[PDB]
Curated annotation (Swiss-Prot):
It comes from Mus musculus. Heterohexamer; oligomerizes with other LRRC8 proteins (LRRC8B, LRRC8C, LRRC8D and/or LRRC8E) to form a heterohexamer. Can form homohexamers in vitro, but these have lower conductance than heterohexamers. In vivo, the subunit composition may depend primarily on expression levels, and heterooligomeric channels containing various proportions of the different LRRC8 proteins may coexist. Interact with GRB2. Interacts with NOX4; this interaction prevents the ubiquitin-mediated degradation of LRRC8A. Belongs to the LRRC8 family. Its main location: membrane. Inhibited by (4-[(2-butyl-6,7-dichloro-2-cyclopentyl-2,3-dihydro-1-oxo-1H-inden-5-yl)oxy]butanoic acid), which plugs the channel like a cork in a bottle by binding in the extracellular selectivity filter and sterically occluding ion conduction. Lipids may block conduction in closed heterohexameric channels. This is Volume-regulated anion channel subunit LRRC8A. The gene is Lrrc8a. Coiled coil: none annotated. The chain holds residues 402 to 808 of 810 of the full protein.
Length: 407
């Protein structure tokens, strides 16, 4: 009676109204605090992301096989019970499985029998008595995994993940402040491209990090690096293109950082850098530069050595003037320059053309240069600016911007 009442409550129309999209722009359905899964969910054929959140001991009927495009599946605090035709359609269609848990029994034993599983986030502790990576021992059977996110408060890495890593390309382990014992057991990551140690608290870089030639994304976030000294051995790794060293205790950057040229999204934000050096601007391929929340003494001129740079965020620094060299760069779009000590913007900012978003709530800009109104791609949504200095501008320029906004 409870199941059939659930079917009668949540009809297909309001479910279509409630349909949303995930981060991957895929059709998702967030079922929160439900007694079960209505068959109106399973009557769908175009669903790809079946999200199941806090449903007590549900039993999945076979009609999931009708959901022809089903690829993702979100289990958050949900004990899932499934049958064999469902397992068949998930063995031929399903290539993703997102399991969030706080208990071993919440994790079902069917999820290890998938023949197309490719993306897989296990959230919750996986280390237990006779169950430390033995909850999930069927991850050998899954031979097509490519993404493995583990928010599990983990202390060691299984070798079987290293075996799977012939096809796996992303491993992000969240441990809430627990150090793993790497011991150079990660070198089978030939296909790994994004090693993301979130809140690892390593304070050191093992050789396995700069032994893996396919790594392109390296963020040692919240690892409390007082010093970063292992970038020199990265030149054997030809594929590194983005060093997003953010949210760290990095006190200083050695001048040898000027040796690099090939980075694009150099994000060195949320650090303790005393000043940006000219050496850092020897990197010619930089397209994105985030230096938010630093102790930079000033902004030098060599920031204008970045022609392909698109977004620049030197927010929450001690910066007073933007050089004309920065305005020779035609590709500046997102200039998060706010909460600074900026005295003024030199009129050579009229050279700028592609400015899109700027933040100026804060700073010390005495009055708006009219060149800030000159930027075409910069609209009212992008020009997050004070209103009085905007009113200091001639009314007809404001009218032109308004007409561009509304027509």
């Amino acid at each position: 009676l409870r199941q059939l009442n659930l079917n009668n409550e949540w009809t297909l129309d309001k479910l279509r109204q409630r349909l949303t999209k995930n981060a991957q722009d895929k059709l998702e359905l967030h079922l929160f605090m439900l007694s079960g899964i209505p068959d109106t969910v399973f009557d769908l054929v175009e669903l790809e992301v079946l999200k199941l959140e806090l449903i007590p001991d549900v039993t999945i009927p076979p009609s999931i096989a009708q959901l022809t495009g089903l690829k993702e599946l979100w289990l958050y605090h949900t004990a899932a019970k499934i049958e064999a035709p469902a397992l068949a359609f998930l063995r031929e269609n399903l290539r993703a499985l997102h399991i969030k848990f706080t208990d071993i029994k919440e994790i079902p034993l069917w999820i290890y029998s998938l023949k197309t599983l490719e993306e897989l986030h296990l959230t919750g502790n996986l280390s237990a008595e006779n169950n430390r990576y033995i909850v999930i021992d069927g991850l050998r059977e899954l031979k097509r995994l490519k993404v493995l996110r583990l928010k599990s408060n983990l202390s060691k890495l299984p070798q079987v993940v290293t075996d799977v890593g012939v096809h796996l390309q992303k491993l992000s382990i969240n441990n809430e402040g627990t150090k793993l014992i790497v011991l150079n057991s990660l070198k089978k990551m030939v296909n790994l491209t994004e090693l993301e140690l979130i809140r690892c608290d390593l304070e050191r870089i093992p050789h396995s990090i700069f032994s893996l030639h396919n790594l392109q994304e390296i963020d040692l976030k919240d690892n409390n690096l007082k010093t970063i000294e292992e970038i020199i051995s990265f030149q054997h790794l030809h594929r590194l293109t983005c060093l997003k060293l953010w949210y760290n205790h990095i006190a200083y950057i050695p001048i040898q950082i000027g040796n690099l040229t090939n980075l694009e999204r150099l994000y060195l934000n949320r650090n303790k850098i005393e000043k940006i050096p000219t050496q850092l601007f020897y990197c010619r391929k930089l397209r994105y530069l985030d230096l938010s929340h630093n102790n930079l003494t000033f902004l030098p001129a060599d920031i204008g050595l970045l022609q392909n740079l698109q977004n620049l965020a030197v927010t929450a620094n001690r910066i007073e003037a933007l050089p004309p060299e920065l305005f020779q760069c035609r590709k500046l779009r997102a200039l998060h320059l706010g909460n600074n000590v900026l005295q003024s913007l030199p009129s050579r900012v009229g050279e700028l053309t592609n400015l899109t978003q700027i933040e100026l709530r804060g700073n010390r800009l005495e009055c708006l240069p009219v060149e800030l109104g000159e930027c075409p791609l910069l609209k009212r949504s992008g020009l997050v600016v004070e209103e009085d200095l905007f009113s200091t501008l001639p009314p007809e320029v404001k009218e032109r911007l308004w007409r561009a906004d509304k027509e």
